[PDB]
Amino acid sequence: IIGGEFTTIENQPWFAAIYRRHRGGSVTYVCGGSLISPCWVISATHCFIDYPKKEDYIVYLGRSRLNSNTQGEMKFEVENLILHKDYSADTLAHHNDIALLKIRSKEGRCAQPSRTIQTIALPSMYNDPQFGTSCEITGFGKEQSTDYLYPEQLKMTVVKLISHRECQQPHYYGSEVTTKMLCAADPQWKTDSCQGDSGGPLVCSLQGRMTLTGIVSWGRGCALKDKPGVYTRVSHFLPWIRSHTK
Numbered sequence: 020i021i022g023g024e025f026t027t028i029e030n031q032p033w034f035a036a037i038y039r040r041h042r043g044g045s046v047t048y049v050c051g052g053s054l055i056s057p058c059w060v061i062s063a064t065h066c067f068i069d070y071p072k073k074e075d076y077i078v079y080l081g082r083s084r085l086n087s088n089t090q091g092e093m094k095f096e097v098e099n100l101i102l103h104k105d106y107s108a109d110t111l112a113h114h115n116d117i118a119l120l121k122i123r124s125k126e127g128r129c130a131q132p133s134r135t136i137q138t139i140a141l142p143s144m145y146n147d148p149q150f151g152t153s154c155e156i157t158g159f160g161k162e163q164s165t166d167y168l169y170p171e172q173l174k175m176t177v178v179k180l181i182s183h184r185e186c187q188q189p190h191y192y193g194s195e196v197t198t199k200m201l202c203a204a205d206p207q208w209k210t211d212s213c214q215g216d217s218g219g220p221l222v223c224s225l226q227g228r229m230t231l232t233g234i235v236s237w238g239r240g241c242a243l244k245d246k247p248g249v250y251t252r253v254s255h256f257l258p259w260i261r262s263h264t265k
């Protein structure tokens with residue numbers, strides 16, 4: 020996250036921290052995720068497509084820091100890694116950028132909801148917020164595009180939804196951004212999601228209800244003028260999520 024503020028897991032309790040174990044035993048951060056039900060984390064397929072072995076991943080819930088065992092955190096393995104069959108990547112645009120991770124503690128249990136571990140409600144069909152709506156993003160992603168290290172402390176920011184017609188402008192993304200994708204950005208281009216924020220939540224308060232409107236997917240650079248962050252429109256994937264979590 021470029022700009023924004025530092026935060027803690029208590030303010031983002033649906034936030035999942037996903038890491039990968041490498042041969043030799045080193046563990047690195049991969050992407051963010053969202054708890055949608057106690058056994059299920061939703062994220063982006065692009066985060067896992069090149070390393071699709073479920074055994075390699077570690078999921079934390081209730082974790083506030085990249086390298087701290089936050090009090091109340093829960094560690095999980097991936098019981099089932101579900102990648103979208105129609106996932107694809109163009110030069111910029113990522114299509115069907117959605118993944119489901121069935122989580123399991125070493126005792127075979129799913130998440131235990133607490134003050135720091137909570138689910139985030141899914142959107143309803145054909146009911147996404149209107150353009151100009153403020154939404155929040157959370158992640159351990161880059162603070163600057165020039166950084167190679169991720170922040171130690173979890174960050175969040177607030178961005179505004181951009182209409183499809185504005186996002187299809189030639190100086191924006193033209194026809195590369197589709198109706199299955201949501202653009203969101205800072206009108207001043209100072210805050211945005213960035214590399215390492217992928218898979219993470221775009222949470223919108225809609226009709227008084229805190230909703231998982233999007234999933235951090237793609238963008239041209241980070242906090243670049245006329246280059247919004249592009250998010251998977253979760254409302255389009257309700258049949259896919261339902262069928263794959265049953």
Ligand SMILES: N=C(N)c1ccc2cc(/C=C/c3cccc(CCO)c3)ccc2c1
Pocket residue numbers: 065211212213214215216217235236237238239240241242246247248249
């Ligand atoms: N402008 C944005 N909001 C935005 C959103 C998502 C982004 C996602 C990336 C992803 C980078 C990436 C993906 C897969 C592998 C790798 C190399 C391993 O570090 C890098 C980069 C910039 C981004 C910028």
